[PDB]
C-alpha cells in the first residue's frame, strides 16, 4: 500500500556510532544482530536537518551494491518519510557510485545524500557495511556535522518510522507515499544509476574523440576492471555502449553483493587478474576501480604500472587534452603530503599553485570551493577534479584516454617522456600492519625528537656513492587558508636538498594494533637513472629511513607487510 502510518519506536542508544570522514563502518553482522543499530544512525543523521527545512529537502540515496545495501535503503526511506523529508532520489536497484551521488546532489541541489558503501572493504554476509553522509555541496559531511550525529546517536531514545512503507527500487520513475495525518506526500524518484553521471562526463570529455579512439580496427584496446563493484554498469553504458569499446573491454562489470568474494581494492595484488591479462601484451591500457568508484589503478601495455603519484602528474602535464579544463582553465593543483613530488615538478614548470595538504577530503574541498583547485591526487590510488566533490576513478580513466588520443603514444612512452622532461620521482609506500602501538609510538616520538634538534638540518646520509643532505625535518602542520583550521602532527617529514623525501605516519590503533606508513620519494634527473628498477633506486633512502627511525629495533619488523 502507498498509504502508510507514522510510528514512534522506542530504542536504546549505542555508544560507538562515530561516523568518521568516510562514514560509519561496522561488520554486516553488527548491523544485523544489533537491534535498531541502523535505524538509530539514520535517525541521528536526519535529526541534523532543521524540521522546517525537511519538506522542501531532497536526499540522494544509493550505494555500491554490497550485501545489506537494499535493506538499509528501505530503512532510510521508511525513516526519512516519517521525519518529514519531502523527497528521496535513489539510483535504480539502489545502485549509485560515490561520484554519481556527488554529481546528483550538486545537479539537483539536494541538501545531501546517504551513501551505502564501505569502499574497498569486503562485502557479503560476513563482510563490512558502511553508511556515509554527504552534504549539500556534494562532498563528505565535515567534522562539525559528524560530531553532531555522533552526539545524537549516543542519547537517542526514539525514532520515527513508517514500518509499512516499501519502495520498489527496480522500476524508474516517481513513487508517491501518502502519510497518515500528514498533508504533503513523501516522494521517491528512482533514477537510472548511470544517466546523470554519464551526462556530466559527456560535457567534461570529447566523447566524439573517445569514440574514434576506442572503435574500429585501429582502436586503442582497453580492459577496465570494476572488481565486481559499483562502477560496472558505468563502464558498460559509457565506455562500451556509448563510446563503442567492444563488450569484452568491461571486466568484472556486474555488481555482486560480495564483490565476488574479494576486496574491491585496486592495486597490483588485489587486481592481479587484470595485471595478468595486461601482461599478455594484447591491450594498450588497463584500469581497476574500488568498490564505490572513487579510486583507480592505471596500467599500460604488458602490465606497466603507472603509480598514482605519477598518474596525477601526467594528467596535469597534459591537462588541456580534456575539454573541461580548456574552458575552466587550471585553477590550481594539490596532493596529499605523502604523495610523491611529481605533481610539483609540473606545477613549478607551468607556474601553477601547488597545495600540499594533510590527508583528507576537506582540504581539497575547501580549495575547490575557493576556485583554487582543478586537479588533485593522492598516492593511495586517488585522482579527482573540481567537477564534483568526491574523487572519481572512472573520470581519471577518461582523462587518461583523452590524453592517449591527443598524444598518440603508448602509456609507457608517455611516462618515459614525462620522466625525461621533469625528472622521475621514484616512489613507494611501505605499510607495517598490526604493529604494537606502544613501540610504534615510541619510534615516532624518538624520531621526532631527533629531527627537532638544531643540528639535524644539514646532516648528511650516504648510500654510499651518493650523499643525501637534510634540508628540512618536521612534523607536518597545515593552516587551512579557507576555514582557518590548523592540522598538527600530520607526519614526520625528512626533506633532502636533492628533492627527495622520507615520510613516516602512524595510524590510529585498531583492534589488532596500528599501521606505520613509510613513504619514500627519491628524485632523479639523470637519464642513466630514471629508467632503472624502482625498488633498486629506492633502496638507499629505504636504508636511511630504517636506520634513522630504528624501526626494526622498535617494532621487531624486518620487512613491511605491504609494498606499493
Ligand atoms: Mg572508495
Amino acid at each position: 500500500s502507498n498509504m502508510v502510518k507514522i510510528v514512534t519506536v522506542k530504542t536504546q542508544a549505542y555508544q560507538d556510532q562515530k561516523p568518521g570522514t568516510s562514514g560509519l563502518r561496522k561488520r554486516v553482522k553488527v548491523f544485523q544482530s544489533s537491534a535498531n543499530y541502523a535505524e538509530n544512525f539514520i535517525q541521528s543523521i536526519i535529526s541534523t536537518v532543521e524540521p522546517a527545512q525537511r519538506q522542501e529537502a531532497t536526499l540522494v540515496v544509493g550505494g555500491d551494491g554490497r550485501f545489506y545495501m537494499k535493506e538499509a535503503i528501505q530503512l532510510i526511506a521508511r525513516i526519512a518519510a516519517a521525519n518529514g523529508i519531502g523527497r528521496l532520489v535513489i539510483g535504480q536497484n539502489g545502485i549509485l557510485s560515490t561520484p554519481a551521488v556527488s554529481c546528483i546532489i550538486r545537479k539537483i541541489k539536494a541538501i545531501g545524500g546517504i551513501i551505502l558503501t564501505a569502499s574497498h572493504n569486503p562485502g557479503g554476509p560476513n563482510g563490512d557495511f558502511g553508511i556515509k553522509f554527504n552534504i549539500s555541496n556534494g562532498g563528505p559531511a565535515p567534522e562539525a556535522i559528524t560530531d553532531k550525529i555522533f552526539q545524537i546517536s549516543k542519547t537517542i531514545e526514539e525514532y520515527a518510522v513508517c514500518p509499512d512503507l516499501k519502495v520498489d527500487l527496480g522500476v524508474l520513475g516517481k513513487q508517491q507515499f501518502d502519510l497518515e495525518n500528514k498533508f504533503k506526500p513523501f516522494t521517491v524518484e528512482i533514477v537510472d544509476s548511470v544517466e546523470a553521471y554519464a551526462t556530466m562526463l559527456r560535457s567534461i570529455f570529447d566523447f566524439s574523440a573517445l569514440k574514434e579512439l576506442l572503435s574500429g580496427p585501429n582502436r586503442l584496446k582497453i580492459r577496465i576492471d570494476a572488481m565486481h563493484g559499483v562502477v560496472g554498469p558505468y563502464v558498460k553504458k559509457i565506455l562500451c555502449e556509448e563510446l563503442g569499446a567492444p563488450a569484452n573491454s568491461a571486466v568484472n562489470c556486474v555488481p555482486l553483493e560480495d564483490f565476488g568474494g574479494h576486496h574491491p581494492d585496486p592495486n597490483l595484488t588485489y587486481a592481479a587478474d587484470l595485471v595478468e591479462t595486461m601482461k599478455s601484451g594484447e591491450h594498450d591500457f588497463g584500469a581497476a576501480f574500488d568498490g564505490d568508484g572513487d579510486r583507480n589503478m592505471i596500467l599500460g601495455k604488458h602490465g606497466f604500472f603507472v603509480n598514482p603519484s605519477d598518474s596525477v602528474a601526467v594528467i596535469a602535464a597534459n591537462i588541456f587534452s580534456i575539454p573541461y579544463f580548456q574552458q575552466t582553465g587550471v585553477r590550481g593543483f594539490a596532493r596529499s603530503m605523502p604523495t610523491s613530488g611529481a605533481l610539483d615538478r609540473v606545477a613549478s614548470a607551468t607556474k601553477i599553485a601547488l597545495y600540499e595538504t594533510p590527508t583528507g577530503w576537506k582540504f581539497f574541498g575547501n580549495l575547490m570551493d575557493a576556485s583554487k583547485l582543478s586537479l588533485c591526487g593522492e598516492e593511495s590510488f586517488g585522482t579527482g577534479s573540481d567537477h564534483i566533490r568526491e574523487k572519481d576513478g572512472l573520470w581519471a580513466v577518461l582523462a587518461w584516454l583523452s590524453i592517449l588520443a591527443t598524444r598518440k603514444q603508448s602509456v609507457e612512452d608517455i611516462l618515459k617522456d614525462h620522466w625525461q622532461k621533469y625528472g622521475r620521482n621514484f616512489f613507494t609506500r611501505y605499510d607495517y600492519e598490526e604493529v604494537e602501538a606502544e613501540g610504534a609510538n615510541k619510534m615516532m616520538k624518538d624520531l621526532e625528537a631527533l629531527m627537532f634538534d638544531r643540528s639535524f638540518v644539514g646532516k648528511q646520509f650516504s648510500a654510499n656513492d651518493k650523499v643525501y643532505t637534510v634540508e628540512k625535518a618536521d612534523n607536518f602542520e597545515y593552516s587551512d587558508p579557507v576555514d582557518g583550521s590548523i592540522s598538527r602532527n600530520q607526519g614526520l617529514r625528512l626533506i633532502f636538498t636533492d628533492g627527495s623525501r622520507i615520510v613516516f605516519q602512524l595510524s590510529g590503533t585498531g583492534s589488532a594494533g596500528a599501521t606505520i606508513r613509510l613513504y619514500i620519494d627519491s628524485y632523479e634527473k639523470d637519464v642513466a637513472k630514471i629508467n632503472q628498477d624502482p625498488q633498486v633506486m629506492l633502496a638507499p633512502l629505504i636504508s636511511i629511513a630504517l636506520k634513522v627511525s630504528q624501526l626494526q629495533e622498535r617494532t621487531g619488523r624486518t620487512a613491511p607487510t605491504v609494498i606499493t
Side-chain angles (χ1 to χ4, degrees), residues 1-4 6-11 13-147 149-326 328-453 455-461 463-524 526-564:
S1 190
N2 289 64
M3 170 173 306
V4 300
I6 298 175
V7 153
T8 302
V9 173
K10 289 173 167 181
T11 194
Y14 295 90
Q15 300 310 315
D16 69 335
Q17 308 191 305
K18 198 195 296 103
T21 58
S22 43
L24 181 73
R25 299 184 170 161
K26 303 293 171 180
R27 287 289 190 199
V28 164
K29 297 306 228 317
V30 164
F31 282 98
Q32 285 179 314
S33 72
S34 300
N36 295 326
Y37 199 82
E39 288 87 340
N40 285 17
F41 189 66
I42 295 156
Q43 175 66 72
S44 295
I45 290 168
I46 288 169
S47 289
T48 66
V49 177
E50 271 287 296
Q53 305 163 28
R54 298 191 185 165
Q55 181 56 48
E56 291 325 291
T58 299
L59 285 166
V60 180
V61 178
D64 67 19
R66 68 186 56 230
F67 181 88
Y68 190 73
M69 173 188 77
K70 284 204 288 303
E71 176 173 3
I73 291 164
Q74 296 291 342
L75 284 191
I76 288 156
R78 291 196 231 119
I79 294 177
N83 271 274
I85 296 291
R87 180 175 66 157
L88 297 193
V89 170
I90 311 181
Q92 187 172 34
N93 310 302
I95 291 288
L96 288 174
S97 73
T98 287
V101 172
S102 192
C103 167
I104 292 163
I105 291 172
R106 293 160 68 69
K107 178 182 201 170
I108 73 181
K109 293 162 183 198
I111 64 156
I114 297 170
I115 313 184
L116 293 314
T117 179
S119 196
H120 66 264
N121 295 281
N126 292 286
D128 295 342
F129 194 76
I131 302 181
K132 172 167 150 53
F133 185 49
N134 278 30
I135 55 162
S136 70
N137 76 340
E143 179 186 20
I145 286 174
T146 53
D147 279 351
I149 291 167
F150 185 36
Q151 282 300 83
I152 293 162
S153 75
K154 272 184 296 185
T155 55
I156 190 184
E157 302 184 273
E158 57 178 39
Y159 64 93
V161 69
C162 300
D164 297 332
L165 182 158
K166 176 91 168 149
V167 179
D168 194 328
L169 299 181
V171 296
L172 301 177
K174 173 192 74 168
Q175 282 163 63
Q176 191 192 105
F177 306 85
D178 305 294
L179 308 189
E180 183 153 352
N181 302 306
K182 291 305 195 212
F183 183 79
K184 286 193 232 84
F186 175 68
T187 299
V188 173
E189 293 265 355
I190 307 291
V191 293
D192 181 85
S193 300
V194 176
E195 181 275 315
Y197 175 90
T199 294
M200 175 181 60
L201 293 209
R202 186 177 307 116
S203 176
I204 291 180
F205 300 103
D206 183 349
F207 274 22
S208 172
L210 296 184
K211 203 168 181 192
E212 214 211 322
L213 173 76
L214 295 173
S215 313
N218 63 323
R219 62 179 192 284
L220 189 87
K221 293 187 178 186
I222 76 186
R223 282 297 181 265
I224 307 295
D225 189 335
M227 304 193 80
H228 311 296
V230 83
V231 191
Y234 298 81
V235 174
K236 281 185 179 203
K237 293 193 185 194
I238 299 174
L239 287 166
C240 296
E241 292 182 26
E242 183 165 3
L243 296 183
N248 290 350
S249 306
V251 179
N252 298 330
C253 278
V254 177
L256 303 179
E257 300 199 349
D258 67 349
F259 306 105
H262 308 302
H263 293 206
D265 192 357
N267 67 27
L268 287 185
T269 63
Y270 284 122
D273 284 355
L274 174 68
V275 175
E276 191 47 50
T277 293
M278 293 310 293
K279 273 213 169 66
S280 81
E282 192 200 331
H283 307 96
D284 300 296
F285 176 90
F289 307 120
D290 69 339
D292 62 331
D294 70 337
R295 314 212 296 194
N296 68 104
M297 174 173 74
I298 305 289
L299 303 176
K301 195 157 178 174
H302 307 294
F304 176 75
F305 172 65
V306 179
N307 91 77
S309 305
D310 276 354
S311 189
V312 68
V314 174
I315 295 164
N318 309 79
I319 193 158
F320 296 112
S321 298
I322 297 162
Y324 174 89
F325 295 114
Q326 301 191 351
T328 75
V330 176
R331 305 153 170 156
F333 294 132
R335 61 163 174 84
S336 66
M337 181 273 289
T339 302
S340 98
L343 184 57
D344 303 43
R345 318 299 295 206
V346 174
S348 289
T350 65
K351 318 223 200 161
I352 301 270
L354 190 289
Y355 303 111
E356 181 180 31
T357 66
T359 305
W361 172 261
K362 59 191 226 200
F363 306 104
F364 297 149
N366 282 345
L367 296 164
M368 299 185 328
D369 287 344
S371 322
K372 282 305 202 309
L373 183 45
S374 290
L375 177 74
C376 61
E378 290 165 349
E379 48 77 41
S380 47
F381 298 90
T383 322
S385 90
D386 65 339
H387 69 290
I388 53 165
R389 301 279 179 284
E390 297 275 3
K391 298 173 311 285
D392 188 344
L394 182 50
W395 178 95
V397 166
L398 264 72
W400 256 101
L401 299 179
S402 309
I403 288 158
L404 291 170
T406 78
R407 289 285 299 267
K408 303 169 174 315
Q409 308 182 260
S410 70
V411 174
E412 186 173 356
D413 277 355
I414 289 169
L415 264 297
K416 280 171 177 179
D417 284 4
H418 189 98
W419 297 325
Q420 172 174 170
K421 185 171 187 180
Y422 294 106
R424 174 163 190 187
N425 291 80
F426 289 100
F427 187 85
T428 196
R429 184 184 91 234
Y430 272 28
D431 298 317
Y432 302 75
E433 286 172 26
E434 294 175 14
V435 299
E436 196 287 301
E438 291 316 310
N441 287 277
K442 177 183 171 53
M443 186 193 77
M444 295 296 283
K445 284 225 292 143
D446 290 348
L447 175 55
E448 182 171 8
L450 210 74
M451 299 180 284
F452 184 64
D453 179 84
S455 65
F456 194 72
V457 165
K459 191 177 184 191
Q460 297 193 321
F461 297 87
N464 313 76
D465 153 47
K466 152 96 176 190
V467 183
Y468 292 93
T469 300
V470 175
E471 171 175 291
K472 182 172 195 161
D474 69 2
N475 201 343
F476 186 55
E477 162 185 319
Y478 180 84
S479 293
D480 182 288
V482 176
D483 68 23
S485 71
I486 298 167
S487 303
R488 306 182 182 69
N489 307 316
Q490 298 297 310
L492 301 171
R493 304 189 303 165
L494 298 87
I495 300 152
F496 299 95
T497 54
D498 81 335
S500 306
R501 307 174 288 147
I502 292 160
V503 176
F504 283 92
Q505 288 180 332
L506 177 52
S507 82
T509 308
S511 38
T515 297
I516 294 163
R517 297 183 302 261
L518 166 58
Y519 313 81
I520 315 281
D521 178 2
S522 183
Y523 180 72
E524 295 292 347
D526 184 17
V527 316
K529 291 171 166 288
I530 61 170
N531 276 294
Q532 263 184 259
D533 177 289
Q535 300 305 136
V536 172
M537 305 291 317
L538 289 158
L541 272 180
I542 291 167
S543 172
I544 287 161
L546 298 172
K547 290 195 203 331
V548 69
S549 70
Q550 293 296 283
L551 183 147
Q552 170 175 323
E553 293 75 6
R554 298 288 83 79
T555 70
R557 302 294 179 85
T558 59
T561 313
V562 176
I563 293 172
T564 301

